[PDB]
Amino acid sequence: SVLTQPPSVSVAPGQTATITCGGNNIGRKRVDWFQQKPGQAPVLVVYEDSDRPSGIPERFSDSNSGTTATLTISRVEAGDEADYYCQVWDSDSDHVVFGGGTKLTVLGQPKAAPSVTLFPPSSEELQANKATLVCLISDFYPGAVTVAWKADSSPVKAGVETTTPSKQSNNKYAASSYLSLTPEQWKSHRSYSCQVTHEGSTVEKTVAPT
Amino acid sequence: QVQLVQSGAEVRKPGASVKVSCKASGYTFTDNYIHWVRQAPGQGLEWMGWIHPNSGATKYAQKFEGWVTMTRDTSISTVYMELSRSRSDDTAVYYCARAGLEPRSVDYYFYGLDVWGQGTAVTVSGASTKGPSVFPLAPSSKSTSGGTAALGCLVKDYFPEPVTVSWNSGALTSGVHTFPAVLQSSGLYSLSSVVTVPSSSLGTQTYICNVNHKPSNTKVDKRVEPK
Amino acid sequence: APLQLGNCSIAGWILGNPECESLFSKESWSYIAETPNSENGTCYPGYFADYEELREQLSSVSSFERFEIFPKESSWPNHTVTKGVTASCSHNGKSSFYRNLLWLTEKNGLYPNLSKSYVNNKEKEVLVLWGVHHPSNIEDQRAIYHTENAYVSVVSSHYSRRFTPEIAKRPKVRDQEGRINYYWTLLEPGDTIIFEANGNLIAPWYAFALSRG
Ligand SMILES: *[C@@H]1O[C@H](CO)[C@@H](O)[C@H](O)[C@H]1NC(C)=O
């Protein structure tokens, strides 16, 4: 089985947040939810039908409602900010398939938009039989972005490396993306573009050889 | 209280044998299954398999079948997870979890995962200590958001971590933002530092970034000039 | 005196259906035919062996006593008895099972071979009913019983049969693709019935001592 989860869900304090886990999951099929705070092992929050195990607040509830899995947290507080995963048991192979993951952001500061600065390969780097494109993303909130590189409108997924978003000094989030290309490939194409998508909106930066 | 203490951090070369231990305490060792999951850096959880101390039965996932092996030792209450062959993509944090959540019905007879370990940092990506190659990201082209321009230098192909980047020997502290590095498939880190400086001062003011890589004792200063 | 059984059938009242026992019980009766089928009889899909023969024998039974042939806690030490419930046999919104039959599951990752017997000293013929589970999928068989070549052996002086359940997906009946076939036998006084199985056994919980005179 494959379980699909939204990459990020934003909720203001005091409201109710709902995380979705999709797939052919029948009526109950257990459906277990886990909580992973940064730099910490996952912890189980709800199992079976609701059933908060140890100290998980009653605000947490697990409702299936068809071929989807739903986790509901009411009166969201600061402590609820973590990554939540959905887990089922595919009885066709007895394999414990996990979900993609959802970054639940409790909005504490106004939502921002990403700032993109793309740098073409330097003259010295091209002299060393190397070529790298540096795409820098900063001052975006919540800390969840998607980066897609393009070369003459053709999507490129070879040699793309991207840091996970990290909290900056201004409590916003930053990330960087790199495109490793040969010197011949860099000047073969007419232009190279770095596309960053955040909260639906997309910001594109394009550079060309000289 | 019931807990699982895992082995320490591991660094291996590609093709090496990565072995992770998981000691159990606070409960009868041969009671519940032990599950193993793998989390790539800033990625989701991937299930690997389970082993039951009482029976020794093992069921691995299709992705990990063959090259992973789960063993157990009831004398020391320790379960092992050995990866016979390793690759750069296997660099992740490995968790061992106890299936202490008893089921309720035969229709849903599964033992849920309740007690987790602390994780084991396995970084394969096998390389040796290497000095950083610094290339200047010139402030050239249309980098003007109004009065201001962006420039920096690229710290590339260095190992291990960390590296320290300063500008003008500490004179330039405002508008400095150094980004975290990327672990490339070659196993070498690479980060970038950028400074937002006025475009008017470009051409008259000299901007030099200072890179100090203590693990290799490599200190290099690079001047970032427009053209 | 007759035996009135709700909407239930003979199997439902004799298997211990959660809703059947709440209506009627009796010891002396002469009429038993209330409702044939398509009722609260079998809350779990399955086949009742010798149903018509059991109906004829159960008809006109002078004395009827319900006793615990195998105590729940004492009989099976190395198996889990509380795990056996299903939504298809739910009572009052909670998953339940037959009152006279107990589902046996694995305990602590193992399902040790079991050998339990009952000696009849009641001076009356004893009705013993049990079941054999047929899992719908092979993975569920491994989870609950930890064995693929499941065997159930019921041997006595008068009755002797060995069951080898096979995993076969079947059309969904009462939201259960799996099946549990029900079998019964009568224990003559002075005889002992032996149960041997490595899994897939619905061991008896309560038996009925009966007389036909
Ligand atoms: C089953 O019994 C209940 C009461 O015990 C009754 O209300 C219902 O009508 C019965 N079902 C049928 C089909 O007669």
Side-chain angles (χ1 to χ4, degrees):
Chain A
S1 286
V2 154
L3 302 175
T4 304
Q5 272 180 275
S8 58
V9 161
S10 291
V11 58
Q15 306 177 329
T16 298
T18 290
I19 297 141
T20 306
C21 175
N24 314 85
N25 304 321
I26 315 284
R28 189 221 199 221
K29 261 174 91 143
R30 187 64 150 257
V31 176
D32 290 336
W33 291 90
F34 292 87
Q35 189 203 61
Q36 182 158 41
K37 284 151 292 213
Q40 259 185 69
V43 65
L44 169 80
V45 278
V46 298
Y47 63 89
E48 287 157 19
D49 51 317
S50 280
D51 284 322
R52 306 139 280 280
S54 189
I56 291 317
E58 41 197 359
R59 329 181 266 107
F60 289 63
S61 44
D62 177 27
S63 166
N64 182 85
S65 286
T67 51
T68 290
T70 279
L71 172 70
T72 294
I73 302 131
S74 321
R75 294 141 43 224
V76 192
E77 44 179 68
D80 301 340
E81 195 162 352
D83 293 357
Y84 289 89
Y85 294 84
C86 63
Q87 174 219 285
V88 298
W89 319 73
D90 174 67
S91 206
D92 305 322
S93 64
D94 213 18
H95 295 165
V96 199
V97 284
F98 272 98
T102 303
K103 182 164 210 170
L104 182 82
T105 311
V106 194
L107 305 176
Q109 78 148 94
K111 305 216 259 215
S115 158
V116 193
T117 309
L118 178 58
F119 286 108
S122 63
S123 180
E124 196 193 9
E125 189 180 26
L126 288 169
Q127 280 167 20
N129 216 45
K130 272 175 326 194
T132 308
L133 274 83
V134 182
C135 200
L136 301 172
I137 320 164
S138 73
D139 285 9
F140 66 88
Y141 185 85
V145 285
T146 82
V147 191
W149 290 79
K150 306 233 171 163
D152 296 353
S153 95
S154 321
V156 161
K157 257 171 164 255
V160 178
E161 300 268 335
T162 300
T163 50
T164 56
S166 61
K167 219 172 60 187
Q168 324 174 200
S169 52
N170 41 38
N171 221 58
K172 306 223 225 317
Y173 283 78
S176 64
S177 197
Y178 299 85
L179 195 42
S180 285
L181 307 155
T182 74
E184 316 98 52
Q185 274 169 337
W186 158 241
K187 297 180 222 162
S188 274
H189 296 81
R190 188 250 170 200
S191 100
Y192 271 89
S193 319
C194 178
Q195 237 167 266
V196 187
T197 305
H198 174 255
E199 285 232 295
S201 172
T202 305
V203 186
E204 189 201 68
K205 240 50 163 202
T206 304
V207 294
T210 316
Chain B
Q1 186 129 357
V2 177
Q3 73 203 349
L4 311 176
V5 280
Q6 307 196 219
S7 66
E10 264 202 17
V11 187
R12 290 292 206 271
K13 315 264 161 213
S17 282
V18 172
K19 194 179 277 79
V20 183
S21 88
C22 182
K23 185 96 152 54
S25 46
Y27 78 112
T28 309
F29 176 55
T30 49
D31 278 7
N32 326 285
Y33 311 82
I34 308 283
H35 294 246
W36 290 86
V37 306
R38 151 170 140 190
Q39 213 198 351
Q43 302 223 319
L45 314 157
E46 311 140 58
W47 181 69
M48 304 185 65
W50 58 259
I51 176 155
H52 203 289
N54 227 339
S55 59
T58 48
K59 183 68 180 295
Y60 314 120
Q62 173 94 320
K63 189 159 278 333
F64 301 99
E65 209 96 58
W67 48 291
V68 78
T69 285
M70 267 148 228
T71 78
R72 94 212 182 288
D73 218 321
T74 67
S75 57
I76 47 185
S77 291
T78 312
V79 306
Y80 305 92
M81 191 263 311
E82 190 221 65
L83 302 139
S84 60
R85 211 157 278 119
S86 55
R87 215 211 82 91
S88 147
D89 48 26
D90 296 340
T91 298
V93 194
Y94 292 78
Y95 304 95
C96 61
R98 158 217 203 211
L101 207 70
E102 285 221 299
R104 303 262 160 191
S105 193
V106 284
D107 320 310
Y108 303 111
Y109 208 81
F110 321 105
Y111 281 81
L113 273 62
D114 61 336
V115 172
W116 290 68
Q118 89 259 9
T120 295
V122 169
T123 304
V124 185
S125 298
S128 196
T129 301
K130 197 202 161 288
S133 296
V134 189
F135 305 112
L137 313 169
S140 100
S141 284
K142 264 38 176 70
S143 286
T144 46
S145 211
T148 50
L151 68 91
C153 49
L154 169 66
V155 182
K156 208 205 158 53
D157 294 342
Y158 77 95
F159 172 80
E161 279 262 7
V163 86
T164 59
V165 193
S166 49
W167 285 90
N168 297 312
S169 293
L172 195 51
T173 56
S174 163
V176 189
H177 194 264
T178 307
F179 289 81
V182 284
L183 188 53
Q184 315 159 123
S185 53
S186 53
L188 295 163
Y189 298 91
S190 286
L191 51 84
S192 266
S193 192
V194 72
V195 282
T196 325
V197 312
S199 68
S200 322
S201 80
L202 274 188
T204 312
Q205 176 72 249
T206 50
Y207 293 110
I208 297 121
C209 76
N210 331 99
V211 174
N212 164 61
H213 186 238
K214 263 303 201 283
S216 68
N217 312 295
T218 306
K219 306 195 42 193
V220 281
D221 314 316
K222 186 64 77 135
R223 203 173 321 200
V224 196
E225 271 154 307
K227 277 310 311 171
Chain C
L3 178 65
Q4 305 291 321
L5 298 175
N7 308 331
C8 290
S9 61
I10 301 176
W13 145 77
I14 211 69
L15 283 181
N17 179 279
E19 311 285 349
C20 287
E21 269 53 31
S22 308
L23 296 158
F24 282 96
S25 63
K26 210 168 192 172
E27 304 139 347
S28 57
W29 80 83
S30 295
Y31 317 111
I32 208 167
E34 297 294 314
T35 55
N37 59 345
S38 70
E39 319 285 330
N40 288 11
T42 55
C43 61
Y44 204 97
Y47 157 69
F48 205 118
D50 314 328
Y51 190 52
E52 292 296 331
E53 282 64 41
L54 180 67
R55 150 187 279 101
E56 293 296 4
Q57 304 293 328
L58 266 188
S59 296
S60 299
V61 160
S62 64
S63 85
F64 213 75
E65 181 196 0
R66 185 170 171 265
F67 68 99
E68 215 170 354
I69 175 176
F70 298 127
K72 188 185 203 180
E73 298 74 3
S74 175
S75 296
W76 312 271
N78 300 335
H79 306 84
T80 312
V81 300
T82 57
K83 286 309 161 278
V85 280
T86 178
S88 308
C89 298
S90 171
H91 176 262
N92 285 354
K94 249 73 63 182
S95 289
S96 186
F97 199 64
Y98 298 104
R99 270 68 203 262
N100 305 326
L101 304 180
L102 171 59
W103 201 313
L104 286 186
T105 70
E106 57 90 40
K107 186 179 183 182
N108 294 356
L110 280 168
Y111 197 115
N113 300 2
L114 61 88
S115 176
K116 202 70 178 184
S117 54
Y118 176 71
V119 191
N120 186 2
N121 39 34
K122 315 284 283 183
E123 295 178 8
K124 310 156 58 164
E125 271 195 341
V126 162
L127 180 58
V128 175
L129 313 104
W130 67 93
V132 174
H133 184 218
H134 294 248
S136 50
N137 62 95
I138 186 168
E139 258 65 46
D140 273 350
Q141 161 90 48
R142 251 173 296 192
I144 319 170
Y145 314 113
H146 285 297
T147 175
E148 169 183 329
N149 313 330
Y151 83 93
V152 179
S153 191
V154 187
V155 176
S156 75
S157 300
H158 297 81
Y159 176 89
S160 175
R161 193 165 164 181
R162 180 182 169 93
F163 316 88
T164 59
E166 184 183 5
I167 288 94
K169 197 158 299 177
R170 273 193 168 268
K172 211 180 59 177
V173 172
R174 300 184 62 93
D175 266 8
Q176 288 287 331
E177 296 174 345
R179 303 282 201 269
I180 295 180
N181 293 352
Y182 310 99
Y183 310 94
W184 69 273
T185 187
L186 269 165
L187 195 65
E188 198 251 339
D191 201 13
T192 305
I193 179 171
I194 316 174
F195 289 91
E196 285 188 345
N198 61 353
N200 306 51
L201 163 67
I202 310 301
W205 192 3
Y206 275 87
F208 310 97
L210 49 94
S211 294
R212 42 214 280 181

